[PDB]
Design an enzyme around this catalytic site. Structure first.
Site: not given
Length: 129
Positions: A35, A46, A48, A50, A52, A59
């Site tokens: 990660e 991301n 998205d 949000s 991380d 996130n």
């Protein structure tokens, strides 16, 4: 902080991770390698939006405060950058609860694909604790 293999994780047990909530100590050190590359300063936004954060890749959408996240719940009650810091003594608390959710490890995408069905205790092998 750039952590080594055997020196990046001895603190987890220093923070209560041994077989915590049924997850083996064989299953913890694999994921962070997947990660943030043993890195604490790696946070990734991301598609998205949000972003991380941390090695843990948390996130901005469901857990912490960044403010560029609309409708964010912020259940963790911690500044997102408080996670990445050289001292990681507090970030694990939200982590130690993320699993109690009953999804446990579901939140993380790497453990489910790259660490699932793996030789997990072969990531704790060869070290002194």
């Amino acid at each position: 902080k750039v952590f080594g293999r055997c020196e990046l994780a001895a603190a987890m047990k220093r923070h209560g991770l041994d077989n915590y909530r049924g997850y083996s100590l064989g299953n913890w050190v694999c994921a962070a390698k997947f990660e943030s590359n043993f890195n604490t300063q790696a946070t990734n936004r991301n598609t998205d939006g949000s972003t991380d954060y941390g090695i843990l890749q948390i996130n901005s959408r469901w857990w912490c405060n960044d403010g560029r996240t609309p409708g964010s719940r912020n259940l963790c009650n911690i500044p997102c950058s408080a996670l990445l810091s050289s001292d990681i003594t507090a970030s694990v608390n939200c982590a130690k609860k993320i699993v109690s959710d009953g999804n446990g490890m579901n939140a993380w995408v790497a453990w489910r694909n790259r660490c699932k069905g793996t030789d997990v205790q072969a990531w704790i092998r060869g070290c002194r604790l």
